[model samples]
Target: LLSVVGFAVDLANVWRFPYLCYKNGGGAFLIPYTLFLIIAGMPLFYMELALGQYNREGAATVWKICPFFKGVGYAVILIALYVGFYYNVIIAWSLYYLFSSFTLNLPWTDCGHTWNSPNCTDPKLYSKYKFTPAAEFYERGVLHLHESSGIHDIGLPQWQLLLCLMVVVIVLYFSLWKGVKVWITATLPYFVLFVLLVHGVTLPGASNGINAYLHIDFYRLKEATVWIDAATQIFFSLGAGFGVLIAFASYNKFDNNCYRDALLTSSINCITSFVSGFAIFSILGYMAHEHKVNIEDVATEGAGLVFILYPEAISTLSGSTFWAVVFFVMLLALGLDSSMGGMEAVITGLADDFQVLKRHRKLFTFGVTFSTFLLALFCITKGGIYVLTLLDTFAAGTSILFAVLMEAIGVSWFYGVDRFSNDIQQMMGFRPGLYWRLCWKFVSPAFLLFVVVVSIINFKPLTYDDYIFPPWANWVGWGIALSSMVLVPIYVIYKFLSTQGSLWERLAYGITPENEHHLVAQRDIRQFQLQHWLAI
Candidate 1:
């Protein structure tokens, strides 16, 4: 339960959910968020957590129950690798923000610095055309986007940027090479959230911010975007498709009640997101009040809200210095704890799959982090923001939905729900009841597949502000998505030929439990039998 919450409730809860909640009708948004959390979200936790604990295998090799489903494991593991690279970049950015605040004054307060531009205006006297000190500090002072035109021009890693990235990598290296208990990592972030809420609710505009957050705009709920976003947000926040939960649970004792853990941990993760709105929006209201602008104007999502808006909001307040230090350092811890699970998934999944990797865990962990450290240079460049946004949208975004849907289908259907339930019962006395089986076998995958189709059908040219992604960008993004998705068929073919037999024989053997080959001699493999297909 604790480790699930540790990995599940990091950057997504902090940056995305609060921003999404406000825009999608606040408390009204929670209605669908809660609904999806039940049908689509809760079942996933039950499956992965129970599956891993029972199997005693990481995500990839856990498919010994069904070899054909093995690719789903690799796909998710690969997906995590992609997400880990980008998150490392994000963590370094957080580190830079944290390091900048230990000074005589907040640099973004008035913007007379070497990095500030002529058009930079204090938010209190803000106008539409003029830029805020916070944004300029972000784009020019931090990102250095002025030096490059677009994604086409990837530049050398900025030396300081590279320095922070290296430190993030080293921090991860030590994190994975040795054990750091979940207690230290899992508890501190919640500790920070409580501290901020205490400070946030006291701010001048705090009430309006929280009010806006929970405004419960019923009419806004009619929009399809709300439902779609609510669904995606739950999966994203809980990390429904990511291999981290499976890897984490694989470490659990076989008899551990992961079914109960699934419900409680996911519940806490979702509830924590709802509560984080106060910490986020209260500061948001404070920012709006300081800027003499509407809350809607300052309201933004993801990195912009954290690195730009919140930091600027703090820098302008009385006794802002302490808040700045606290806020940024808190961000570092959140990013680290979150990154630990994801990178750990890649490590555990691969090491479990190959005995060679298991033997050299430390060397492989270093290799894994360092290789991603090099790949993360794309995000460390002057054009890095564009690269970062691309991955955020596709790598962690739609690809996860695709990868997760693959997983839901593979285990729930192909592995046979009856067998899965029996497997669970073998671990603990209770078998998942009828509703659980229905959601797992029928409802959840349909929910996932519908969302996947809708997301693809609604896809348009990718953009950040007025800047359009190049014409070919969609191809590259979809290719990144497909690279993982395509593995299913690729591995299916390999599994078919690798087994020696006729096509029918190969098909039967491929789907049967790895240790149950004797069922083939009995001519009664549950997988190939008629009752298996129709029963679930």
Candidate 2:
């Protein structure tokens, strides 16, 4: 259960939310975000948990309830694989900083590195013309990012990042090479985050950052983008539409109370995001005041906020290296859990689909680990930062809402919400009340579909800093987004042409469960084996 919570509460809570909170409207942003959490996020979260616990199958095989929409499962596992491929590189970045923390002065403290620029200036200097030392280190020392020239200008791998990536892969392999049951490794970040928060909030000028984080501009809430961001943030941060939730829950006993699990874990995740905002912004506030800059000026999103901006703030603190090591350790712990969950989701989905592979779990693990490690090499390249940005934008971004919307429709509309609730009652010993029924059948699907539509209408070409993706690059991105969604219709057509019966008969049979008895028999065999072993 703690592993499930750890998987949901990820780097997004720490690095992504505070920036998005301030950007969308500070405290006011909470309104739409919470509404989506209740209407869309929690409902979907509960559905996956209940589905997995009841079906006792991985994400892909759990589609027995609505076989025609089996593509939904395939789509989600693919997203998990795509995310796993790149997400570890973020952990590699954290490892890079973790090793560098042993130094007397943080490497980012001065512009002496080979990657330093003439434009780099000390934060203490507070010159408007000077870029922060943190930004320079990120662009130069870390990413070695090339100017935006599209995906075609692929560059060679950075030796430093590749070495870090190797270490990250080794760490991840040992953590989950056995199976998905590492609770301590998963929950350690929660404890460390509080330690950092305690230290950060006590720092000088910390209140300035906290206030900036909570400061609301009501006018910003009027924008459509703010609402869209609220929905997407909930989806992104909660690990929705990624198949990890179902994959994790699939291991539970048939009677596991996943309804309660869903409510409690999702709540913890949101509250963590709220508290982490204070932790992050307080340090940013200190950095801004020390540099004599506005809090807004110090603000950055994604990798910049976590890797660059936060490290700069750590440099100004007493025992800067100690704090730097602590911060990076927290990042490493956080990313490890989420990355492990994604990898496990992909592996489990495949193993469940191919019964022969289940007999050789360790071999399957090595193959997946090696394959993903090779794919991740692209992310550690000199041009890898851009690759990461493009993949992140296309693979795990707006396209998720589309996949999730289809999932909700399949379960609620096609399989019938009443039937789903009954299955939950069978396992949980109580039927969910009217509130959940209302959300699943109407509220969740409507909200997800609305977000999907709004995203399409508002879509723009992906960009990183000053360089915009060229038209061809945008096309490639669209192809990436379409890759997951296209599975649904393709499977629908394949099922239609393959079934030999009248149209209505074929449609009816397509939605029936093929392996409902498989899990029951498997569970019985395991229980019997355990009892027999005990008798010996």
Candidate 3:
């Protein structure tokens, strides 16, 4: 359960959620977010959990339920791998911050580093300033970021960040070097979060930050982007579409109450995101107050909000170094668990696909870990942020939604929801009722389609800070998006064309789950048969 919950709650809850809340309709954002959570996120969450729990296989192998669309599994696993590569870069950033916290002066506080520009503003000392010191530290000290051109202008790598990235890889290797049963790893982050939340809320001007976060702009909801971002947040927050949910659930016993666990974990994940918003924005509020600026001035999202803005805020607090240490420690713990789970999903899927790979788990782990480490080097470059944004906007932002829509369509329409409930009845001695079936068959798919369509209609070219990516860069982003999405139809046609018999017969053959008792342990097989599993 710790592993399951750890997979869902990560750094996004702290950095991304609050800024999204502020940017969207503020308090009004919850309406669309919660509504979609019920219709789309929760139902899909339950379906994936149930699918894995019953099938007793990893993400890719469980596609026996719909053999032709096996690409859904592969697509999700690929996304997981793609995300795992970039995600660790974020963790490495946190680790760099964590190590820097032990210093006498927080690195982001003053404009003394070689990276600091002459125009860099000390928010603490100067009431009215130009460049934020934290912003300069991020652009110069950390990322060594260059002005945007395109991917072709790949600049020199920053050795500091690369060394930090190496440390991140080493930590992840040891964490998953054994498996996903590391309870301390899963739960320690929450403890850190609890302590930080307590410290953050008690700081001066915290209420102002919370107010800025919770302030409602009902007009913003009418904008399509707000609704779309809320849906994306819901999807990303719950660990849906990434295949980690399915991978974790695959380890459950056949008779496990996955329905209850799904509801429980999803609720916990969402609530943590909501509550962490209060904790984070309170600190940002304090920063705003100290700088004599509006809360929005200090509030940013993604890596900037975590590394630059928050560290700047922490540097101004009374016990500056102590708070900085705690904050970065929290970020490190939060990012590591999510990274471990994502890497595990990729590893688990590969092991299941090639049984021979299972016998060489450590060898495979090293290969994947090292290769991803190399790929992640691009993210630590002078032009790395541009690359990260391109990958993130395309791979993480757009492609997962397409994969999830396919999952809903494949399961609800093709696999047949009624048949799935009946299968659930066979395993658990009771069926999920009409509401779940109705959701599976109707509401979930429609809502997912709606989000996907609206997102495409409103899509914008990728940008970072004030720099617009060139036209060719947008095409590269589309290429990344297509790489994952193209798998579905290609495999669907492949399955259709390769199978024997008439078109209808091949279609029928492709949609059905292959009944394989040997896949289960002998004990489980005997017990399942004894219980009259064919009642479905």
Compute each candidate's TM-score over C-alphas: 0.93, 0.90, 0.89
Q: After superposition, how far is residue 210 of candidate 3 from its true place, in Å?
A: 2.6
Cα lDDT listed for each candidate: 0.78, 0.76, 0.74
Find the 10 residues in a row with the least total lDDT in model 1.
123-132
Q: For model 3, how does the per-residue alpha-carbon lDDT over 178-290 read when each residue is reduced to its tens digit? A: 77535554565566567556767787887887786688676777777777777777767777878887888888788888788778777887677666666667777777776
Residue 138 of model 1 has an lDDT of: 79
How many residue-pair clashes does candidate 2 contain?
0
Candidate 3 TM-score over all chains jointly: 0.89
Query: By lDDT, is 1 or 2 better?
Result: 1
lDDT (Cα, tens digit) per residue for candidate 2, span 290-353: 6678776664554456786568667766899888887788788777777887888888888898
Better of 1 and 3 by lDDT: 1
- Indicate which candidate wins on TM-score: 1
Tens-place lDDT per residue, model 1, 245-273, is: 78888888888997878888778977787
Q: Model 3: residues >4 Å from true position, as ranges?
A: 1-8, 126-130, 146-152, 177-205, 316-318, 516-536
Which is the better candidate, 1 or 2, if ranked by TM-score?
1
Clashing residue pairs in candidate 3 (N, C-alpha, C atoms within 3 angstroms): none
